[PDB]
Design a protein around this ligand. Structure first.
Ligand SMILES: *[C@@H]1O[C@H](CO)[C@@H](O[C@@H]2O[C@H](CO)[C@@H](O[C@@H]3O[C@H](CO)[C@@H](O)[C@H](O[C@H]4O[C@H](CO)[C@@H](O)[C@H](O)[C@@H]4O[C@@H]4O[C@H](CO)[C@@H](O)[C@H](O)[C@H]4NC(C)=O)[C@@H]3O)[C@H](O)[C@H]2NC(C)=O)[C@H](O)[C@H]1NC(C)=O
Ligand SMILES: *[C@@H]1O[C@H](CO)[C@@H](O[C@@H]2O[C@H](CO)[C@@H](O[C@@H]3O[C@H](CO)[C@@H](O)[C@H](O[C@H]4O[C@H](CO)[C@@H](O)[C@H](O)[C@@H]4O)[C@@H]3O)[C@H](O)[C@H]2NC(C)=O)[C@H](O)[C@H]1NC(C)=O
Ligand SMILES: *[C@@H]1O[C@H](CO)[C@@H](O)[C@H](O)[C@H]1NC(C)=O
Ligand SMILES: *[C@@H]1O[C@H](CO)[C@@H](O)[C@H](O)[C@H]1NC(C)=O
Ligand SMILES: *[C@@H]1O[C@H](CO)[C@@H](O)[C@H](O)[C@H]1NC(C)=O
Ligand SMILES: *[C@@H]1O[C@H](CO)[C@@H](O)[C@H](O)[C@H]1NC(C)=O
Ligand SMILES: *[C@@H]1O[C@H](CO)[C@@H](O)[C@H](O)[C@H]1NC(C)=O
Ligand SMILES: *[C@@H]1O[C@H](CO)[C@@H](O)[C@H](O)[C@H]1NC(C)=O
Ligand SMILES: *[C@@H]1O[C@H](CO)[C@@H](O)[C@H](O)[C@H]1NC(C)=O
Ligand SMILES: *[C@@H]1O[C@H](CO)[C@@H](O)[C@H](O)[C@H]1NC(C)=O
Ligand SMILES: *[C@@H]1O[C@H](CO)[C@@H](O)[C@H](O)[C@H]1NC(C)=O
Ligand SMILES: *[C@@H]1O[C@H](CO)[C@@H](O)[C@H](O)[C@H]1NC(C)=O
Ligand SMILES: *[C@@H]1O[C@H](CO)[C@@H](O)[C@H](O)[C@H]1NC(C)=O
Ligand SMILES: *[C@@H]1O[C@H](CO)[C@@H](O)[C@H](O)[C@H]1NC(C)=O
Lengths: 139, 137, 363, 364
């Protein structure tokens, strides 16, 4: 209607960059972002540190960039700009972020099976090393 | 308003049935239609998918395949007025992820591996000392 | 009053005599007053035999003053007519010389035909605007009159003419657009439509033709999309992203690119035209190229590739690539700190156990 | 006395006004008595508009019985005249009908005048065989004698005439495929080559001083070769290797595929024509794709791609991809796997020390 925001879903790989664009008319002041994980159900204000999350603003295109994402960035980001001439908050429905890992199906399966094959061996040897000496020394 | 309550993704495996919903606010006199929309500021017209199948406003889709991605949008209008439209629920699908040993993931197996290793080293030193130093004397 | 001087040459067959003879009429009427001096200068020289300049009869034109009419005549033989002589009409009317140069044979002057292109309506331009327009374009003519771009159906009957003739061009290569209209069903039935072009410099019209084939079968495309090759990126100059629409029938695919949600201008990409598949008998393939700066591709900037074909189940599909054409399952699992702690602990633990092994071997 | 009916038409440069209009004259003099009628016709339809018949006035004669004269006129639009429609005028003298034709179609001149042109040697012909030659094609002519084709030089020098003349063309015409072997550097120098054609009927030679169109500067293409996409390989039906050339000038590049040293059949790959580049000036790009069976791709089989251009130094370059072109998937995946490998090695390497120490202590 008045505030247009894209994209709707982003699924990157850990380490890369993400950009989110809020399209709004250049009349009613400046735009302030928000944040919402799925633990909450009411958007919170967004902090900002240089090198990580950073904001800019052209004529009628406001953007936000995050560098080197990680697993603690899986939330929905909202852009909000209230009219200073009419006093009405206008808000889009924002974006979503997901952070994928470095592995595939094939590697994971082998790693899991090797790890379990190793993990049973230590149990067997600990049982042997606790049962043999007591049976030997107890005579 | 209510045009923000809908989630932003849905998780299904192929061959199953997904569930959506559109929380109407006009007292059982409105019209509910479900559409499938493109990226945004699109040029091709959107397509008409299906009407409200049950009184409470739920859409059910079956026979999931690879080509069933994309945004699903519910559009509701009351008679002669303009329609009200949410901003969709992106759908992402892939079936495979397997079972094995659901109890713990890699986040736990490494820790108990290292604990078992250190405990084994701790417990495999005293028996040798007891067997050896108690034999000469 | 300066009259309108006109000369009406006979056709070649209309000859009579031995040797055969014919006549010219140098009828220049609509003039006043009576005074007139007519000279039928053959090769610039007057003829003293056969020139019959009749009396100056009054033209009873009630509206305004009564003007006068004249009727010049001159006879020539068959050999004289084919001698290609300039039988110029020079009338010293009212002390003013009026000249009218004409040939003496069947001479469509002289030889000049160029081009005409008939463009049929595609499929994307029927589903979007709901109007099956069809145009046939005439290129690089001169901005003269008497151009008539007329469409005719297969039964001889015609449809409407054009509008919006283009403007001047640096090479004097003006153009016309003979747009028309037709109901969709008639075009889908597949009958031949022809557009005819006429001109003052054309010895004959240019009957083009356009129709739609009937009986083709439907197959669906398979759009892939490739990123730039590493050797291009190592130059740090540019990159090219290519779609690939492989194995569809019939023709007329329709593609476009989007970025940031705003479609790109048509001056970036260069689409190709369908051409037959080597090994398959009746299928085609196409392409597309987008050129972007190399620094743009290195900081995100996901791109898309929208196609539209009439055999696809939902008429549209869309792919994408940014830089990380990856990101499979296991978002949170597989660990990242345990894998370091375990490696460090088991690097320490074996080294510690080696001392016990040494002591054991000693004892 | 029947009149002498004549029909006159205007020249093509005789139309004026908006819309442009002209006239036609149907005249018949030397008739007696005054009983005469005139009717115009338009392909079977008579139109009364724009008809101006004069009165039956006695002809001014010095001897013999005095006859009469009449003049009739019709007005037409130009778009009708230029559309090849036929107008006829009919005169009824004493109830006798006289009709005469008229139309704007007296163009034909049945002679030996035919189109004589040439096809220049494309770059494929010269590179493959070093056999620079040019062909002068002749059509619109039937079987004659002394039909001699002479590829005249700048000063009309010696020419090896064509052989193996074909049969009569299905037009009822004859195709004279002129040909003459030629040197190399003369064609690159902008020299005038006219195939003067001698004939028994019309020996007028149609001369065309064809030559190389001096022009655009020199640039060299670069070959980027692309392996097939993954989602195609998953289908396990076929793969499509792509050879890409960009930024060359002028046009007319030549490319062919080759594996194990012997060339593939020309029915296995498709090459597109050069097209302009959207950003730069009139430089071009072209694409060639080869479709292989997916089972062959999972073994080896380099599939080199060979191009051939003009500005290119040695006129040949090759590219090669077989199965290893993943190209730096990431900078951390390999470190992750390496760390896991070290940990996995050290586990089993550690267990040996415990087993060996315990058994050696027990066995002492
Ligand atoms: C002086 O400057 C002026 C100003 O530009 C020049 O005028 C240009 O003249 C060109 C002459 O070729 C015009 O180009 C033509 O018009 C279209 C623009 O590209 C294009 O349609 C034409 O392409 C046809 O020819 C191809 C080669 O023969 C065919 O293979 C092809 O199929 C094309 O035919 C149709 O093409 C359309 C695409 O638009 C398809 O949709 C149809 O399906 C095709 N139908 C058929 C049956 O083939 C051709 O390039 C150019 O438009 C014009 N510029 C204008 C009008 O602005 C002068 O040439 C220049 N003088 C010089 C150089 O001496
Ligand atoms: C009689 O029938 C025969 C077939 O049995 C037919 O022969 C062929 O006609 C074509 C069309 O005239 C000839 O093609 C010409 O020459 C070359 C050959 O490749 C073409 O490239 C030419 O195309 C150019 O010129 C055209 C006209 O200016 C352009 O429109 C076009 O875009 C190109 O610029 C040209 O078409 C062909 O050579 C002959 N075959 C042989 C063996 O010569 C013949 O045309 C029929 N005759 C008549 C009067 O219909
Ligand atoms: C954005 O607008 C506000 C409101 O006027 C003003 O403080 C300033 O122009 C901007 N705020 C910044 C840059 O922190
Ligand atoms: C804003 O966009 C315009 C495009 O019209 C561009 O020229 C300008 O540099 C942009 N401003 C900034 C600060 O990037
Ligand atoms: C639905 O929401 C609108 C706000 O957009 C509100 O005005 C209306 O009262 C609501 N309807 C019900 C039944 O709560
Ligand atoms: C609801 O919409 C459908 C299609 O959009 C229409 O057929 C139907 O008549 C509508 N119902 C009402 C009550 O307007
Ligand atoms: C893109 O959206 C803007 C409004 O945000 C609109 O003005 C523009 O027309 C849209 N693009 C197209 C191609 O319609
Ligand atoms: C259907 O909607 C009603 C509200 O009218 C709600 O109580 C019920 O839980 C819904 N059923 C499902 C399966 O969502
Ligand atoms: C899934 O089913 C639909 C309709 O039955 C079909 O069009 C589509 O191609 C199928 N998907 C795959 C991957 O076969
Ligand atoms: C309903 O909408 C139509 C527009 O199609 C309008 O002409 C009509 O006046 C409207 N009626 C009411 C009661 O709003
Ligand atoms: C013929 O007459 C026309 C009158 O407009 C004149 O322009 C032209 O030069 C003349 N040509 C000759 C050969 O006399
Ligand atoms: C050219 O076509 C457009 C759309 O069909 C029309 O609006 C315009 O008036 C036409 N040009 C002229 C000069 O009539
Ligand atoms: C005039 O033309 C018609 C055909 O349009 C023909 O039948 C007739 O014979 C012609 N007139 C003469 C005198 O031949
Ligand atoms: C001439 O044509 C014959 C076939 O009619 C062919 O065998 C021969 O090679 C041709 N000669 C040349 C020089 O092209």
């Amino acid at each position: 209607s008045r505030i247009w925001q894209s994209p709707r879903f982003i699924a990157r790989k850990r380490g890369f960059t993400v950009k989110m664009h809020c399209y709004m008319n250049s009349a009613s002041g400046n735009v302030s972002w928000l944040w919402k994980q799925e633990m909450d159900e009411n958007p919170q204000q967004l902090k900002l540190e240089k090198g990580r999350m950073e904001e800019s603003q052209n004529e009628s295109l406001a953007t936000l960039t995050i560098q080197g994402i990680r697993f603690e960035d899986n939330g929905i980001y909202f852009c909000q700009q209230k009219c200073n001439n009419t006093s009405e908050v206008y808000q889009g429905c924002g974006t979503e972020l997901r952070v994928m890992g470095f592995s595939t199906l094939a590697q994971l399966k082998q790693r899991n099976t090797l790890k379990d094959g190793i993990i049973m061996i230590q149990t067997l040897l600990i049982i042997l090393f606790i049962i043999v000496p007591i049976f030997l020394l107890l005579d | 308003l209510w045009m923000h309550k809908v989630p932003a993704s849905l998780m299904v495996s192929l061959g199953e049935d997904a569930h959506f919903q559109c929380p109407h606010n006009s007292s059982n006199n409105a019209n509910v239609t479900w559409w499938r929309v493109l990226h945004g500021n699109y040029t091709w017209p959107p397509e008409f998918l299906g009407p409200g199948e049950d009184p409470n406003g739920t859409l059910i889709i079956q026979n999931v395949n690879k080509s069933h991605g994309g945004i699903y949008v519910c559009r509701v209008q009351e008679g002669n007025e303009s329609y009200q439209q949410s901003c969709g629920t992106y759908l992402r699908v892939r079936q495979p992820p397997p079972r094995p040993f659901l109890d713990m993931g890699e986040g736990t197996k490494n820790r108990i591996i290292t604990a078992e290793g250190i405990i084994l080293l701790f417990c495999a030193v005293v028996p040798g000392t007891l067997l050896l130093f108690r034999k000469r004397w | 009053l300066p009259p309108k001087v006109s000369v009406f040459v006979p056709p070649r067959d209309g000859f009579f005599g031995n040797p055969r003879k014919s006549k010219l009429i140098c009828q220049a009427t609509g003039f006043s007053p009576r005074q007139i001096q007519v000279s039928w200068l053959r090769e610039g020289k007057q003829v003293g035999s056969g020139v019959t300049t009749d009396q100056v009869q009054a033209e009873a034109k009630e509206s305004g003053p009564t003007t006068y009419k004249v009727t010049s005549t001159l006879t020539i033989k068959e050999s004289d007519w084919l001698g290609q002589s300039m039988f110029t009409c020079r009338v010293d009317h009212r002390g003013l010389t009026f000249q009218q140069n004409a040939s003496s044979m069947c001479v469509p002057d002289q030889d000049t035909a160029i081009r005409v292109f008939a463009i049929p309506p595609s499929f994307a331009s029927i589903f979007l605007t709901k109007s099956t327009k069809l145009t046939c374009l005439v290129t690089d003519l001169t901005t003269y009159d008497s151009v008539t771009i007329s469409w005719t159906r297969q039964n001889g009957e015609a449809v409407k003419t054009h509008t919006n003739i283009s403007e001047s061009h640096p090479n004097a290569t003006f153009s016309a657009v003979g747009e028309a209209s037709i109901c969709e069903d008639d075009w889908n039935s597949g009958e031949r439509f022809t557009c005819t072009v006429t001109h003052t410099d054309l010895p004959s019209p240019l009957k083009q033709t356009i129709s739609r084939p009937k009986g083709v079968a439907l197959h669906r495309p398979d759009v892939y999309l490739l990123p730039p090759a590493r050797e291009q990126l190592n130059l740090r100059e540019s990159a090219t992203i290519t779609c690939l629409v492989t194995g569809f029938s019939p023709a007329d695919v329709f593609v476009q690119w989007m970025q940031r949600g705003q479609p790109l201008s048509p001056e970036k990409y260069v689409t190709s035209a369908p051409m037959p598949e080597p090994q398959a008998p009746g299928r085609y393939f196409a392409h597309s190229i987008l050129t972007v700066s190399e620094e743009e591709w290195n900081t995100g900037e996901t791109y898309t590739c929208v196609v539209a074909h009439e055999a696809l189940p939902n008429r549209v599909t869309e792919r994408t690539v940014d830089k990380s054409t990856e990101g499979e399952v296991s978002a949170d699992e597989e660990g990242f700190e345990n894998l370091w702690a375990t490696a460090s602990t088991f690097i320490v633990l074996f080294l510690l156990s080696l001392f016990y092994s040494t002591t054991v071997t000693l004892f």
